[PDB]
């Protein structure tokens, strides 16, 4: 539905990428999600503020993701990719689901040399 800047990270094989994504929503925040769409839409990590963290199929997302709250009330949703290989490139995006309906996504393009 709605988009929220987001850049192109130009990285070198072996780098570390720290993609962060914030929303102010609390009352109407249903879930946060990290997805990698390349030729798949691949769900990496799904966090629900009451039901906890859930990893998408094939993924070890528990160690690479985090959701914390700023006391100015913003929720930080973050994905960390370590020692990125040539294959980790492609379109990462962060999708917030709001109540009762809408979606706010932020798209990150990781381009590896």
């Amino acid at each position: 539905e709605l988009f929220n800047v987001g850049d192109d990270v130009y990285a070198l094989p072996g780098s570390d990428i720290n993609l962060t994504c914030q929303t102010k929503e609390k009352n109407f925040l249903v879930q946060m999600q990290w997805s990698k769409v390349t030729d798949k839409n691949d769900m990496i990590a799904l966090y629900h503020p009451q039901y906890g963290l859930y990893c998408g199929q094939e993924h070890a997302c528990e160690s690479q993701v985090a959701a914390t709250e700023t006391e100015k009330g913003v929720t930080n949703w973050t994905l960390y990719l370590r020692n990125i290989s040539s294959a980790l490139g492609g379109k990462y995006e962060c999708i917030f689901t709001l109540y009762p309906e809408g979606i706010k996504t932020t798209v990150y393009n990781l381009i590896v040399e």
Partner: antibody
Amino acid sequence: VQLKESGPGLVQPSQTLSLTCTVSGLSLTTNSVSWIRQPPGKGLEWMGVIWSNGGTDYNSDIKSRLSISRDTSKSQVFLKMNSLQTEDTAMYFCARNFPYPGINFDWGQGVMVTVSS
Amino acid sequence: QAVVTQESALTTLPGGTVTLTCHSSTGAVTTSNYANWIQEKADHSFTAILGGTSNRAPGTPARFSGSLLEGKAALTITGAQVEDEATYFCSLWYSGHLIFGGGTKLTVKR
């Protein structure tokens, strides 16, 4: 990724039923496990859920008798139900990531538990 | 907390498309009801078909799709195959209690 339910096959209207759902190859910290039962002839009844984060929610008609807990070190969820009645004989299924998040949804095979003297 | 009703029975030819729906007594279904569908065949056999409104479960063929249409959640098979003749149960989530519908009886005329 395999779900196996195990528990007593026949338990008398005296006891407390205890089944345990054991999940291979996944940490219960990023998966939730729910218990659904279906007495023969009757419809499905959801009983409760243990979320990835350890919280729980129960069916309001069984909340008082039902306890769902987990052991993240053995990757197992337990159900204990006191005040066994004779209807409580049913097929007992566990389903992971059900109802939430409903992605990676998978429903075990079920274990028959018959409650009669 | 509400009553979930589905179509009692539906029929198609192979290659047809049918849409089963799943109605919430309590108003229009939001994604926050996490509608899901499991398929029953013989023998106390349940297969997870689709969950979280639109996510196919591991193994579910591509003909299975889910959506929110009208005031309800909807499972749509596109190109029904004879193997899809089954009873389909939907269930809805009402912030703490999960209520199942009665199950639709999909017949696919081989």
